[PDB]
Structures are given as structure tokens and as C-alpha cells.
Amino acid sequence: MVRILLINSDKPEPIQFFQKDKETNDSINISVITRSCYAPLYSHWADHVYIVDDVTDLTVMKSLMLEILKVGPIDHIVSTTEKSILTGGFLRSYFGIAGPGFETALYMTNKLAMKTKLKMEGIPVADFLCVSQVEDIPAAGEKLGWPIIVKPALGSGALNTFIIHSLDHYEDLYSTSGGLGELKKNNSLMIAEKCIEMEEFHCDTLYADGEILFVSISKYTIQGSFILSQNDPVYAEILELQKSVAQAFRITDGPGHLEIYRTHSGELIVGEIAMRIGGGGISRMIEKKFNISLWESSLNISVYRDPNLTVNPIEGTVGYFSLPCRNGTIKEFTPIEEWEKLAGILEVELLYQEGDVVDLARLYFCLENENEVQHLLALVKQTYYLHL
Template structure:
């Protein structure tokens, strides 16, 4: 007896991982809702059942009308939103249509940082003091009222993109300009948060089923994402039986309960301060950078496969299979400019700790636009036998991996010998 083909509505800008997996599954039929400027990112629209363009995937009413029109032809079994830009919209459609999956109020709280912090604070969890900035004109006055130093960021967004530290009046003047780094890249509302002085930053990546955390991996950043821009940046797993990992796993469970999440994967950011742990942010989607590959190598956990299974509301049997060692990924940064030379893939051939190297750019690549914490020239996937080995390895690989740009000053040539 053949399996029934299920119609899946995907609301998405540019995230491709789930789109690729759905297109490869013969039991699924994909209908896409995206924006005109994002369409060139899709290599296989011919394999889709339908493609609908909207001006903004975050416009709930526009996407609702587009979906109702599609429902004249299709009976959708699931709605999928793979990134912050579309997770709330997918939740809204599920709530509006009475479909299974993350409902709108929960999806919205995971993606609107102000709503997220309010929910966590009400549950008694420690988060940074914050202020919502309702309009672009209010940025300067609200920063002064909140007090410095502080961090300002879009209320909607992911990664460390367009996140700025504001320390003094000159920073306020720069951030408040319409053509400045904040307002030229995003629209209000913005969120102001106390600048948290912390010692270490962690991420917890989990699987939640029926409201229970079925799996969680705890990792520590080699450098905090906000500080890691422009330098080698990544993270490494922590031994699951250690006190550090157990403490963070317990906090992860408390955050999941506070957010009201029933079924999804999670990516939680946590700071360790002198006064204890402070919750940064949590997402109900896979972490970025090398996190998915690290989870697969360390535990056999395919985080995108499990995310898709929760989005489709279908069971997926899996048991963690922890491999020996400490697993790490390191991303080597890029900067604006035209690339002249990148290292060869065998740049770390003499480092047995490096199991794989992915080179992401090549000579002639033009780097421009907003750079994220995950913008990179290449990535190294490593395994060591102890957490103590990580700092030395990071330092050695950072010195070895050098990207040259067309505008770099040429190295001085030695004077000829008389």
C-alpha cells in the first residue's frame, strides 16, 4: 500500500535546509510562500507544487490571504517556518486554521525578543533588564533613559546581526542617525538591554517532545558571538556528566517550560556572570554555524531532521549515541573587501585534531553587506580528548588560517644584498 502524499506549506525567506529535505522526500509535496527578492536563492522551484510571492513573509494578513487562495487547490497537512522571519507567521497560520504545531503565541514569543524576555521574567528566570524602543525617533531618548552601558538590537532578528554596544554619548549619536549602523539595516521596534558583564557564554541545543526535553547538548563558546565578530569563533561540547553541563541542562528545561514549548528543537544562549547564570535568548529552530554538524558528530543527532519531524507532526524514533571526545567547530572570519587568496583545504593537514575543513569562499569573492556571527571564510571540525586542549588548538589554527584581500598592504620586500 503506497504512502499518502502530504501537502506542506513552507513560509520562508532564504533558509534552505528544510526546503531541500522536503523536496527529496517523495511522500511530501511542497508549496512555497516567499518574497520576490528571495526567489533566486531557490535552485529547484520546478520541483515544487506551487510558488507564491508576497511582499513580506512577516505580514500576517498578506500571508493569510495568500494561504486561503492556495487552499482552493490544496489541503495542507502542515505549515513549516524554518527561521525567525517566518516562524511566527507559520504559528499564526496554524492557530488561524486550527492545525497542529507551535501556535502563534508561543512562536511569537520565541522570535520577538521583548515578548520572550517578558515571559521568562514572569517565570522567575534571570534575564537582563530591558526596554522596548517603539520608533526610530525614540532610540536616543530611550537609550539615555535606560542608562549606559547597554546593548541595542532589533526586537526581531537572529544571530548577532545588527547588535550594538552603546557606552557613551558619542555612541548614542551614531546609533540614532537614520543612516547609522542600526537604523539603516532594520526598522523599529528595537530592544535595549543592560550590558551583561559575563565570564563565559554557552549554548544548549535540545529536542522537545510532548512538552518534555528528550535530549540536550551543552556547549561552550570559544568566544562570545558578539565579541567573536572578526576573529575565529566557535564552540565545543561539554562532558554531559560534568557539573557545568548538568547545571545548564537543568536551566534549559526550566526555560522550555516557561516558554510553553510542546514540540520542536531548541537553541538556548546562556551567560555565566559573577552572580550566576543569566538567560540570553532561546530559539525554536536549529542553531547556526557548525552546531548542526557538531551535534551529528557527537551524538548522531540530525537536528534539521528532528526539526522537520516536529514541524510535520510525525514521530521520529531516535536514541542518542554519544561518541568519545570533545567536539568543536571553528569558523574563520571574513571582512568587507575582495578576496585575493584563501588557504588550501589541507591547511591543517598536520593537525590530527582537525577532522574536516570546509572552505566557504574563493579568490575573487566580494564580501559586502551585513556580516553575521556566522559569516565565514571557512570552518574546521575538530575533536580533542579534553576541554583543556581547546584554547591552544584555537590559537594555533587562528594563526595558520589567513585570508588575503586585494586592498591588503603588500609585505615589504627585503632590500637587495649589496
């Protein structure tokens, strides 16, 4: 019997994969670790469902894992959420299960451990400070200069990232409730650096047995990005940087998302890496360009199966644009017909409909050259509107 431990939230992709897998294979046993609000998503098909409110708590996870092992051993641990990456790596190493280990997972979660390893190896990285207190921000803000970026060392700073321009900006974020979000609680590690933004790139990879099965290098542009060519001058430089990070972090199997920055000097520094599949349109941008399924392939790797990576690339420069979505009662936005009129657009993906209480949509395109992209951005930027 193949016992698989799945640590997922509400992401439908791994749910559909293992649900369809159980239907076609009697040997498949699915154990699920998820939140209480996600339990009905697994209750009717999964063999075992364990409810956990906080997956980050390694102590509770170890205790739970022991109880799970009593039912039977685990052959594979599948971590499809960001909060489960470090936990997944911890469980694999501690209980002798094949897959990405703790330290490898630690480098793709803890920015402090990530930046520390890269600086020791020779991989160029932006400076940083360890921040244990919001009261240490003025001290940190003066050491490298204002303004600053303050974000949690673990995970990504979704609603926990703040830009502080001055001391009196901080002291009023300190005074307002809650101007510093959950950071004021001082229960989590933080990292801080001066807001340095230039040209940004991102490299999305798929590893197996230490080798790259697939790699796509794109460039960020309302936001968006577009996939670069292998013949692009910067492609070779980013790819070798990907090689360096992979060797340093000992990457062997799984997905990867590495963000690269280019200084005005032209130096390439490493921003952040993750064991995730590219968020938003990135996953779907790749699927249109190469006609391969990142989810289907990576999940096959996670359970030690042969991934069906048959790369059939379409010609031209493929990318996507995302449209911001403000909270409230959606009254009217740009019609689908108005987008599809624009030449080069492949698909328009709405996330909301007319008359909803709340990206709003994603525009996937296919152009022949990169010059058009900055032109297309202007037209999209032009005809987009959201009234609520």
C-alpha cells in the first residue's frame, strides 16, 4: 500500500490529483493535514483527515506524526502550501522519509537562513538585518538608511510587509492600531533592508534527482511578467545563478521559484527563493508557452512517479498581465469582448463576476517580439477600469 501524507489548504490542484488517483488505484492511501475550514474538501474521499489549525508548530506536528505512523508508515509527504514547506522538510528528515529535507526547506522559507547561506557560498545577495523587535526598527533604519522594508523572516509578507520612511512614520505606525500589523506583537522573527527596486526577473524550475527537468526564465513588467528566450543574453547568467543556488541549498526534487534582481550597475543579486509553483498567472503563463502541467508533473515527482513532461513550446513571446481588485461591491469592469479585440491576447481569466462583494482578472498574451509587450501594457493600462 502507498500511504501518502498530503498537507494542503484549499488548493484544488493537489486535491483533484489525489482524488482522481484514488479512484483509479486501490493501493493509494491518502492522509490529509489541513485546517478545520477545509475539512469538507477531503472528508468524502480521503482515507484519513487530521485537523490542524497551525501547521508551523513543529512540536505539535511531531506529536501528530507519531499518531499517524501508528496507523501506518508514510511513503511520501506532499506539501503544497507555503506554510507547510518547512514543516514538510522537518517531518521528512526526522522520520527518514525521502524528499526535500529540513535545511533545504529552511532555505526556501526562512529568509534569514536563506541569506546567511548564500553569503557564505559566494552568491551575491542584498544586505539585511535581523530584527527581533519593532522597537529595533529605528536602529535598523539608520544603519542602512531610510526608507526601509520590514517583513517576517518566515514565509512571505502578505499583509505583514511595511514600508517605513521615517522615525515619526514608525512612531505613528506604532501609535496607530494596528499600523505595524501583527509585527507589533513581537512573536515572530523579522528581516529588514532598504527599499532597493530595479529590474526584476524570476526563474521557475522543476527538479528531479538533482537535475533540472524544466526551466523557464521570465521578467516582470497593474502588474505582470513575460517569459524570456534561451538565446536572451541574460538567460545564461540567471540560469547559472539558479545552478549556484541549487547546489548551495542542495536542491534535488520539487518546484522552485527564484527571484533575481539586476542593479543599475548591472549586477545580478538573489532576492528570494521558494519551493512553490509561480503564483498568479505565472503557472498558467508557463502552461500556455510550453504546454506542460506544472502541478501534474511536480506532484508526480513528490510521489516518486515519472512526470509526463512533454514540452511542446509555441512560438512567440508569451506572458501575462494582472489587474488589481479593490474590495467592495463590483458594479462594472472592462468587458471580455474589449480585451479579446486586442491582437496578441490568448485568454482572459476573470476571478470575479458582475455583482460580487469582495487580482481581478489576468490577461495572457502571445506576441512575436518583446517590444510589443511594453506597447500592449499601455493599451491594457488604458482600457482597464473597475467601478464599485
